[PDB]
Design a binder for this molecule. Structure first.
Ligand SMILES: N[C@@H](CCC(=O)N[C@@H](CSCc1ccc([N+](=O)[O-])cc1)C(=O)NCC(=O)O)C(=O)O
Ligand SMILES: N[C@@H](CCC(=O)N[C@@H](CSCc1ccc([N+](=O)[O-])cc1)C(=O)NCC(=O)O)C(=O)O
Lengths: 209, 209
């Protein structure tokens, strides 16, 4: 710390790290970049991969949303208790990111013509996570183990935006449903989900959700 | 241990971990799954995400190539000397994974009509790595720190296949060129890169490269 988040005025790839920080009682500076400013072409070229979010831990400057989540999980005790749990949380996060990539393409490239096909293919993309919970204390604890990890925050965030995109996508996934309701109930999480910062912030940058 | 790689008869997303295991003097078993066997649909459903590669490390089974690479780095000491380097390495690997994703898209879904555009845009995608090396000991060591890490193996593999796709794409990147030659010169990698198993394995599933 101190933490600073440089990103567009949307939840997108910054919301999971925001929940994580919040749930851990951490504070951070918010450096919002409007599309207008972005198109000026002054910030983009100074970005490692020419993209946001950009993360600053004071001395360390980072890019790549998942790399940032992993850094936070590792430097905050949210990365499992051993090497086996760490490997599994990664396997989980990788799956979360694959689905997120598809979500983004849909939202920004073919919402109208693709949504119908997306929602229909969604169940087969959620099952792997339902299966992971069943194999872990009947799905009573977390995605991996019994302690909140950076992978949970990413998964939770991914499931929440999908419930918005398709209201009943978790109806056939008991474990995931309760899992979502539970984590959301967590004091600082529930509070984060109701804060104006979050509430007023659009999920995506094109007004689609 | 022991180590077992379950994947199609190609290098693709398994060559980097193989090269990694090779440079560490480690041996492993290969369970080659053919296209005809995969089409039977017996194995696919047993995969967490319905895809390969599948990795077995003793009683630990893993899916997702980058999760597998991270597991090996952590367990074999190829994940930096501290948190700062670990975060930096994930930032690199994620970058490598974004370009790999685009590479696969070109190869499998738009090779003939998109290659020109891809190669023309490639310099912009390689610049970040050149930059990363110049900021680390002037670029005489590795991608992050003074010790080889899982990120190097993934980047090295990606760079090698891009030289096959676009001969001389590293001509305008002195650090990245010398980097490849340097790492490819490592005795164990030098041997792997010329080993029959590696050589006899096509780069991708459709023969295009
Ligand atoms: N792998 C990278 C992917 C980053 C990425 O896609 N970044 C987008 C923003 S998230 C998606 C997004 C797009 C637009 C808005 N907006 O408000 O206009 C918000 C979010 C970006 O920087 N785009 C700028 C560019 O490439 O030039 C990661 O995980 O961090
Ligand atoms: N994010 C996952 C992506 C995995 C992936 O794309 N897997 C492909 C194989 S690598 C790309 C590939 C495709 C085809 C061949 N082939 O020989 O026919 C080889 C490699 C797959 O399992 N496809 C089967 C399916 O989805 O049903 C990861 O990083 O591991």
């Amino acid at each position: 710390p101190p933490y600073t988040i440089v990103y567009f005025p949307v939840r997108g790839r910054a919301e999971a790290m925001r929940m994580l920080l919040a749930d851990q009682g951490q504070s951070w500076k918010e450096e919002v970049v409007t599309i207008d400013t972005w198109m000026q072409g002054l910030l983009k070229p100074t970005c490692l991969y020419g993209q946001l979010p950009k993360f600053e831990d004071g001395d360390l400057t980072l890019y790549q949303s998942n790399a940032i989540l992993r850094h936070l999980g590792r430097s905050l005790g949210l990365y499992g208790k051993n090497q086996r749990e760490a490997a599994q949380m990664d396997m989980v996060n990788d799956g979360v990111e694959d689905l997120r990539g598809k979500y983004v393409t849909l939202i920004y490239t073919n919402y109208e013509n693709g949504k119908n096909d997306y929602v229909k293919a969604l169940p087969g993309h959620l099952k792997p996570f339902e299966t992971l919970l069943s194999q872990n204390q009947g799905g009573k604890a977390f995605i991996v183990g019994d302690q909140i990890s950076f992978a949970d925050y990413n998964l939770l965030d991914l499931l929440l935006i999908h419930q918005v995109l398709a209201p009943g996508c978790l109806d056939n996934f008991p474990l995931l449903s309760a899992y979502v309701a539970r984590l959301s109930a967590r004091p600082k999480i529930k509070a984060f989900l109701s804060s104006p910062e979050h509430v007023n912030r659009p999920i995506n940058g094109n007004g689609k959700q």
